[PDB]
Design a protein around this ligand. Structure first.
Ligand SMILES: Cc1cccc(C(=O)O)c1N
Ligand SMILES: Cc1cccc(C(=O)O)c1N
Ligand SMILES: Cc1cccc(C(=O)O)c1N
Lengths: 268, 265
């Protein structure tokens, strides 16, 4: 990949792998989310944040700070097929003075048509205590120059789906997958559960009959609390409707909420 | 990637991704096994295959992994370019072997090697069978004529009868279940998932202080989408060796057996 001419965004092409596709011989949404992470991490390396940290800035490393996702919203129009080339463009923007947004646009490498778009919100956490830490300036200065000055949104529309508030799923859930546990392949380089794993866990409670006859169009996922290496998760889903579902991930023990989300599915 | 000049092997470069590395910021052995599968699949596409030949598809025959042996000297770091070369070799009526060599794309040094055994099986009855002359003739042209081994030992450590782990196991990870990300395009559990499951029963203290050097894994039966697996490990031994067994949580049916060798970091 490479930075664009103005140095305010990063672009990269990926060839969809054999093990990256599902039943339809097209990329899974988890493969997509992994590619968004990879282009985001290559964008960080191209602006001088080395591979000694997981896309953390130089001042973040001095403060023992890491990045944590607060929200993820992905919309796919066409999933790339096995062997197809997909080009992803990514950029960052501070959101006033609370968090940081990372957006992506996915395109067909040949025709240039937009096949997908994503947006995410990020906050910082102390890697040792695992407490969310407030940005008291200085950190913003270290990366402001790397953001577009004028607002640039992947979802520029008024009242788009990425801005919607998510309610908490009421018991009893219509569908469930219980006793989900992460394995070592689910962890990132900081030994935290990869943000993509929670997408896989939310989708575990969707009935196979929906998965086989419909395609995932939109997923919005809020991250409230991290799942630890020794935690057990329960995935709950209820139909709210195109098929729409409300999702909740909670710890098997005490029932503490870790994620809430919604998904929209289109018939094939 | 591309076939080599003689068309008897296939080569491909890969850039190690952020999500493909572990705590050491180097590729996990599961990432390596996924890349071996990918270059093996691309080799098959380059020679006109599906995996299956014309006569295999008429006889309802498929290829299935019987054994996998991987040895890693240096795991590539996040961002490093790794070049993998792969080829197949006939084993007569027994089946076929697929070998791989991993190299540092910059220096050319061999950083790893792998070998696998494949047997034919009727897709309906699940019965393993000998390779017929008609089937063999359909793929011998794509194999090197002179034998070419990734492990050119006469009495190699890759090939040896793995014993069955005796109960009680020293270590265990129980109730492992595959999720949709663990399935391949045919909705079968990906062969690499079994490596991840075997490694789940290794104590974290060994993982943090040691690097995996050798893994040998036998495949006896496939885990279904609705199955639950138990991973069992016992130390057999600066080097630590373990004996492994994967079995179904219910009836205790064996699905895999293996061994791993680890070296202090
Ligand atoms: C550390 C980091 C940087 C940029 C993107 C991601 C992501 O997972 O999408 C990520 N985890
Ligand atoms: C503005 C900006 C661009 C590329 C990467 C980062 C980062 O935090 O890794 C970042 N903050
Ligand atoms: C030599 C060779 C290359 C690629 C695939 C096959 C196969 O039969 O699946 C094979 N036998």
């Amino acid at each position: 990949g490479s930075l664009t001419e103005d140095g305010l965004s990063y672009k990269e092409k990926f060839v969809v792998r054999s093990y990256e596709v599902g039943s339809n011989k097209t990329a899974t949404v988890e493969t997509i989310a992994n590619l968004l992470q990879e282009v985001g991490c290559n964008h960080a390396q191209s602006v001088g944040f080395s591979t000694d940290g997981f896309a953390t800035t130089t001042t973040m490393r001095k403060l023992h700070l890491i990045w944590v996702t607060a929200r993820m919203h992905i919309e796919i129009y066409k999933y790339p097929a096995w062997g197809d080339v997909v080009e992803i463009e990514t950029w960052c923007q501070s959101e006033g003075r609370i968090g940081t947004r990372r957006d992506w646009i996915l395109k067909d490498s040949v025709t240039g048509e937009v096949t997908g778009r994503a947006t995410s919100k990020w906050v910082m956490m102390n890697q040792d205590t695992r407490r969310l830490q407030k940005v008291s300036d200085d950190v913003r200065d270290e990366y402001l120059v790397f953001c577009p000055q004028e607002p640039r949104l992947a979802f520029p529309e008024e009242n788009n789906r990425s801005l919607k508030k998510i309610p908490k799923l009421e018991d009893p859930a219509q569908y469930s997958m219980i006793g989900l546990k992460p394995r070592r392949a689910d962890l990132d380089m900081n030994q935290h559960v990869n943000n993509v794993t929670y997408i896989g866990w939310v989708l575990e409670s969707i009935p196979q009959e929906i998965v086989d006859t419909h395609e995932l169009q939109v997923i919005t996922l809020d991250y409230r609390r991290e799942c630890q290496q020794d935690d057990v998760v329960d995935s709950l889903t209820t139909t709210t409707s195109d098929s729409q579902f409300l999702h909740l991930l909670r710890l098997s023990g005490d029932g503490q909420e870790i994620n809430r989300g919604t998904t929209l599915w289109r018939k094939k």
